[PDB]
Amino acid sequence: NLAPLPPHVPEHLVFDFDMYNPSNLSAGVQEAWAVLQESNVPDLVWTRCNGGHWIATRGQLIREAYEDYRHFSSECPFIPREAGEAYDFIPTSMDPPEQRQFRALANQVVGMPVVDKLENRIQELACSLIESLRPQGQCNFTEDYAEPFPIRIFMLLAGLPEEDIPHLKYLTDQMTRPDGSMTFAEAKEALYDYLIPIIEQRRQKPGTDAISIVANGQVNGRPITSDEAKRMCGLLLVGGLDTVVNFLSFSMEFLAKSPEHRQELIERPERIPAACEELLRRFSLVANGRILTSDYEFHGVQLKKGDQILLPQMLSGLDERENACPMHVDFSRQKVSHTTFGHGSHLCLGQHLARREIIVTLKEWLTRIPDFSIAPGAQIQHKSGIVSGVQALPLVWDPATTKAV
Ligand code: HEM
Ligand SMILES: CC1(C)[C@@H]2CC[C@@]1(C)C(=O)C2
Ligand SMILES: [K+]
Fold it and tell me: Which pathway does it serve?
């Protein structure tokens, strides 16, 4: 499980962290990654896991490297190397300058003006899902809400049938948290197999859905190619199916465990947007990276062309050098420093949709089910990867303490 140490890597920088199965996982996935920020651990380490790669452990370095696309390229942005090599989504597998023209098209389908066309439907689905669960006095939150709420909104946006969710969700998860049955390349190709006939159909007969808009789009005034459209749509599916889905479960687990924070938002609902931001910091969940374009000395460490570096978006906001008492959730925190939605030229385009889904969930859940807890005797298990998540989140409550709107 440990790749031979490259000749240029010194032993004193070796820390064999496994991003797909970190040793301290039972403590919580954020806690497990935060072992990289213990006082004896250097700012930049090499792990022999997952083929061997660097890890920047501190916000300062993570931010610097995300800004410097000349040295730290997105051409191979996933670990392990085979995944990064196969990864060809647009815009994420591109560096500036070529990357930038594709962002505007992606903005047309997932950006703020769209969140606006979707506002009422987002609100309606959250309320309907929560009301359906409310009288039961229990739910399996991952399957009962965290998945169907954002995924059904995405499938609506993309004009895709809801009965396709199990297949698409399985494939997406193999790209971020592989079970071992499929390589990244096999999962990606299966996703493209799905998207190919649909992109063709919607270039022939355009609708108003996101796939039609991307497939018939222009990038800096020239037509998108069918294959650029495919590479963008694949990314949109992964964002739709495996980001907010996981984040909602970290947030709801925290609220189930912290009646004081629930009460704060019930009594002071105007604090919900700020709470969303603080939860985005504390339960940050993404970690991808970059590949070195040249030999480069970075913070006193010799990096070689072709070396991969994991730059965990998750870690910046958990760094005590960015936020004091970083594991503490404080909704009144004055400067909430984080890179949860990335940093540099690839800043998340889905972040407005994500925040709306989070804020609607917090408001509409606490309106109906203010008082809830983790199920008796349950120990909540997390899972780690490119995007981390919660395996299961059984919640209970007394229906007498709930409110039908
Ligand atoms: C909590 C929710 C989310 C988080 C934490 C998140 C995180 C991120 C991060 C860290 C990146 C930068 C990756 C890099 O630099 O290589 C990114 C980019 C992106 N995200 Fe999000 N994302 C979320 C939700 C979404 C959603 C819901 C969508 C769409 C449905 C989406 C679409 C995109 C797109 C298209 C990019 C590519 C931007 C580019 O490469 O220029 N994201 N996201
Ligand atoms: C790293 C991401 C969260 C960002 C959007 C989905 C994701 C898995 C990507 O491939 C880019
Ligand atoms: K690649």
Answer: Terpene metabolism; (R)-camphor degradation
User: Which among 119, 121, 138 is positioned nearest to 369, based on CA atoms?
Assistant: 138
Told to judge if 49 belongs to the known catalytic residues of this protein, a careful annotator would answer no
Which of 243, 309, 311 should be mutated for ligand 1, with most atoms under 8 A from CB? 243
DSSP state of 349: S
Sequence positions preceding breaks in the chain, C–N over 2.5 Å = none
What is the DSSP secondary structure assignment for residue 76, as one 8-state letter? S
Number of H helices, E strands in the chain: 16, 14
All structural domains of the chain, each given as residue ranges with its CATH number in brackets, are 1-405 (1.10.630.10)
Calculate how far, in angstroms, residue 258's C-alpha sits from the geometric centre of ligand 3: 42
CA-based end-to-end distance of the chain: 53
Q: In sequence order, what DSSP letters do the residues of 175-236 get, joined into one string? A: HHS--SSS-HHHHHHHHHHHHHHHHHHHHHS--SSHHHHHHT-EETTEEPPHHHHHHHHHHH
Q: How far is the CA of 341 from the centre of ligand 2 (A)?
A: 9
348 annotated to a ligand binding site: yes
- Does residue 350 carry a catalytic annotation? yes
CA distances (Å), origin 392, targets 101, 147, 166, 287, 395: 39, 11, 17, 21, 10
Resolution (A): 1.5
Q: How far is the CA of 159 from the centre of ligand 1 (A)?
A: 20
Which segments of 217-312 does DSSP mark as H helices, in order?
Answer: 226-242, 244-257, 259-267, 272-282
